[PDB]
Amino acid sequence: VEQKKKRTFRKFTYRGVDLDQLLDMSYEQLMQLYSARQRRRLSRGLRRKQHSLLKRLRKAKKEAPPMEKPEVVKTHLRDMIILPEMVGSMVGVYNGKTFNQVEIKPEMIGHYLGEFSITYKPVKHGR
Amino acid sequence: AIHRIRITLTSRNVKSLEKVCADLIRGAKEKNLKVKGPVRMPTKTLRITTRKTPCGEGSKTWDRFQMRIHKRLIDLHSPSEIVKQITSISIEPGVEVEVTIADA
Amino acid sequence: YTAFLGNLPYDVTEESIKEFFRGLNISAVRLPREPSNPERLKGFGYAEFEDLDSLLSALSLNEESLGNRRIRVDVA
Amino acid sequence: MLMPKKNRIAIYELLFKEGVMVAKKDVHMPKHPELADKNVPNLHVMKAMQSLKSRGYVKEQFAWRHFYWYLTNEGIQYLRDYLHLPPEIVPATLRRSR
Amino acid sequence: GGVMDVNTALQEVLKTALIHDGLARGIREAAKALDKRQAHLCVLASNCDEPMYVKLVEALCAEHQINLIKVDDNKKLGEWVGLCKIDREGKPRKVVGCSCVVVKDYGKESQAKDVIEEYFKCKK
Amino acid sequence: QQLYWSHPRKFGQGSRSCRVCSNRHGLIRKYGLNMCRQCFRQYAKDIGFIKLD
Amino acid sequence: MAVQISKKRKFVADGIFKAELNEFLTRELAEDGYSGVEVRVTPTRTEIIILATRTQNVLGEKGRRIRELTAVVQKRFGFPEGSVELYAEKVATRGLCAIAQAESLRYKLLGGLA
Amino acid sequence: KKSYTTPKKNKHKRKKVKLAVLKYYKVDENGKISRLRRECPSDECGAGVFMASHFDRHYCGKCCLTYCFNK
RNA sequence: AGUGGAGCCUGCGGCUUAAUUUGACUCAACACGGGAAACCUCACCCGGCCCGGACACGGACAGGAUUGACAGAUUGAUAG
User: Fold this and answer.
1) Nearest CA to the C1' of I80 belongs to which residue?
2) How does DSSP classify residue G11?
3) HEC string of chain H?
4) Which domain holds residue D82?
5) Spans of all domains in chain B
């Protein structure tokens, strides 16, 4: 549960930056490079004091053995675009009722965690 | 020496503004200054649109309150101290009167 | 110039004030009393004066109690 | 309730020497006016006073999300004794002779 | 000056320094105080539970203006300090010990703070 | 033992309220009003605004 | 006007002082038979003139209450020392003063009379 | 009634059950104190204050969340 | 001149939702409670601190009631 040539058959650039190079990159470069919505998240949001969770993201990745996914990293926030150091964590994403644990991969880079967690039904009416 | 002093008058009560502007123009000529006259700046209509019905089920009843303030200036080619001396005294209520060193 | 009062104790008005608040003459003062028969101690009335020689006493003879009332000489 | 009779006496004496105390109510506020407990939401500026108020000694008037403690004659006598000050101080409610 | 009794002035010094908020009431404030020259008086009790607690203060006493008077009854000294609002049935903060305290800063005028300060110069 | 009882509220209608109460949905901000649209209906007399037409 | 609040804002802001004062002194000076206030803008003095039908509770004894009645007005509403000088106003008629009468009838209805 | 309720145990407060606050000097003949569980020097600190000898973290309590020895 | 028809908008019914907060039902509920609410707010749901038990009385209690926290466990929060 980690970086490139693994959890990626969807290859080259997600928005303008190749995920193959991106996992060798830092995300301080990725906000500069072809990631405008992520740029507005990483420059204006600017590392938004979820550091204890960000520590826990790097704690549970460290505490679990690296051939396996982390144990649990729950967040309340769902506005998180997956960073190359984030890739691999099984991130509990809260939708205001329930935590949704998502392993985050080279393909999912550029996508918010509220894009894999849902707050909404595929609407039924008896349907 | 003379000193062209603006006397700016702001009020919302016109006849209160008129009875004080009559005092300023005459009293400047009663004890001699420039007398120039009422430079009628236009009124400002402060219009605010409000709801007449709170918890507004039923009919959309709109209510508008207007408040009209009234500006004018009186530039006086007259000696600086006794422009503001004769004018600014004896008028406390109702009307803002702004004597002004500028337009020198 | 009048010194409006909410009470005015025993030297009330109507030749009780013609020698007390001042020495100079007044026109006429209304009081709710009928100031000859009852000798009733009551204040809800007023005090009219001419304000020539009246201002010097009553602003140090306000806030006081001739009986158990409280003279508010507020001039207007 | 925390904040003892050092911070409470900062609120206690400031009522007494003036004759009035002012404060404000909001949870996103933090500050009260008048030399207060220095960027706090609606507490010990009020709660030291509310402790004294529910014992009497003051009238906390209110208007427009704002509080107006009226120093009554008992709090004139109480914080006189509470601050162990000499029994006439003229607590700035008596200073003018009108 | 004056000729007041020492222990009933040891009452009011513990009463005034409590009002002065800095009567180091109990050992934590005391060891913070009596290891400082903020300490200007230290009335000990002899009825302290585990009277190494006396010696703990006595070991704290001999540095930073040694002050060693010894009264009895921690609960009296705790009353002399002031926790108990004496004239009741009981209190929210009724009678419990303040066994050894440190009077930082006598902080007031005559006899009740002057007699023992004469005496603690006459004793020491 | 409080640490969190507040959040930065400068934005939108989740930031302010009325001045004699707490209200949303019509907080008129023009010329320094800071009133909700319903309480100020009781209070329009002291100001100087008027409706003649 | 530069650099104050607008002349539009200023005549808005004039009544804002009027409303909060009258509401508050409805809450407290109703014991005077609260007829209203009169804030007179004079030089170096805010001549507040308290309209009432019982002006024997405005000073208290020896101007006691005014030094806390002003200390509400002078200190909360932005006034320097010596600015808010309180004045009584014992209004002459009260039967033309429905404000003080619906006050006084409330001393007969909530106060107790048939 | 939104979803939040909670129980309490002094989870609403703290007690830290016994609080072994400073009693701690090796007392010889009167009078001299000796350093037990490390004495902390700071300016926020007084002159008697100790550490939470919580070893590899030696937290001075008069220090706020700091001055912790790792030895 | 249109609407309704069309796409869509907003409001509402209904359903659905853990929540789709609430007010309203011909005129006199319905792009209505300037209601253009991201979360914030927020009512609602799903979760957490905290007490605002101030005060009248009484008890714990200066040996520590309480506070503060390292760091760990915890958790959305190394939020003592």
Assistant:
1) H14
2) H
3) CCCCCCCCCCCCCCCCCCCCCCCCECCCCCCCCCECCCECCCCCCCCCCEEEECCCCEEECCCCCCCECCC
4) 1-98
5) 1-104
Per the entry, the structure determination technique was: cryo-EM
Of G12, G18, G22, the CB nearest to F32: G12
| Ranges of each domain in chain G | 7-90
Nearest amino-acid residue to I66, taking CA and C1': H15
Report whether F49 belongs to an annotated binding site.
no
The count of other CB atoms within 10 Å of the CB of residue E26 is: 18
Instruction: Find the distance separating the first CA and the last CA of chain D, reported in whole Å.
Output: 41
Domain count for chain F, please give it.
Answer: 1
Q: Provide the domain count of chain D.
A: 1
Radius of gyration of chain B, Cα coordinates, nearest whole angstrom: 19
Structure tokens at G2: 């530069």
Spatial distance between the Cα atoms of E103 and A32, rounded to a whole number of angstroms:
64
CATH of the domain at D36: 1.10.10.10
Nucleotide with C1' nearest the B58 CA? I28
C-beta separation of D98 from D25 below 8 A: no
Amino acid at residue number E26: G
Interface check D3 vs F, CB under 8 A: no
Rounded to an integer, what distance in angstroms lies between the CA atom of residue F39 and that of residue F22? 10
The number of angstroms, rounded, from the C-alpha of B36 to the middle of its chain's C-alpha atoms is 16
- Which domain CATH number covers F34? 4.10.830.10
Instruction: Decide: CB of A71 under 7 A of nucleic strand I.
Output: no
Judged on CB neighbours under 10 Å (0-12, 13-18, 19+), A81 is buried
A86/A56 Cα distance (integer angstroms): 11
CA nearest neighbour of E82 among E5, E6, E15, E13: E15
- F30 phi/psi in degrees, rounded to 5: -75, 135
CATH number of this structure's domain G7-90: 3.30.300.20
Strand B2-11 relative to strand B62-79: parallel, antiparallel, unpaired? antiparallel
Residue E50 contacts strand I, CB under 7 A: yes
The tokens 């203006």 sit on which residue?
E65
